[PDB]
Amino acid sequence: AGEGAWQDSGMGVTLNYRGVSASSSPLSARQPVSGVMTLVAWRYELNGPTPAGLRVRLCSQSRCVELDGQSGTTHGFAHVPAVEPLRFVWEVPGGGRLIPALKVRSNQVIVNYRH
């Protein structure tokens, strides 16, 4: 059914404060793609510790999925056009300095798709 997969990676955000929502730079296919997403695998790596209370989402143009842990798989992008970029979105709810900062060394996705 015209199946393929694309992948991409990049550096993520730095958060110095709670109560701030920040998006990583978009991840998108390097090859020409068409069709719709099926299963998406994701991973990220931090420099330093993870802040308690961290909320991470992975978002397409019109959908978002909550992430748990530093790697996983989701069917939440089923039927999303495969050409769409994916953004990691990060927040630690509240206020004041984040101690230490959230420092996202890398975040990546593998997107399976079909025609």
Spatial CB neighbours of 99, under 8 Å, sequence gap ≥ 6? none
Measured distance CA(18)–CA(40) in Å, rounded: 28
What's the CA angle centered on 78, arms 1 and 107, to 5 degrees?
110
Closest CA to 112 of 5, 1, 34: 5
C-beta separation of 46 from 71 below 8 A: no
> CA-to-CA distance for 110 and 78, rounded, in angstroms?
14
CA distance 16 to 48: 13
Beta strands in 1-115 (DSSP E): 4-10, 14-17, 22-23, 36-46, 55-59, 64-66, 71-74, 87-91, 97-114
Residue that is written with structure tokens 């730079």 in the block: 25
Which segments within 69-96 are labelled E, that is strand? 71-74, 87-91
- Which experimental method was this entry solved with? X-ray
d(CA 87, CA 96): 25
d(CA 31, CA 33): 6
- Whether 105 contacts 46, CB under 8 Å: yes
Whether the CA torsion 79, 59, 32, 106 is positive or negative: it is: negative
Yes or no: say if 28 and 86 are a contact pair by the CB < 8 Å rule: yes
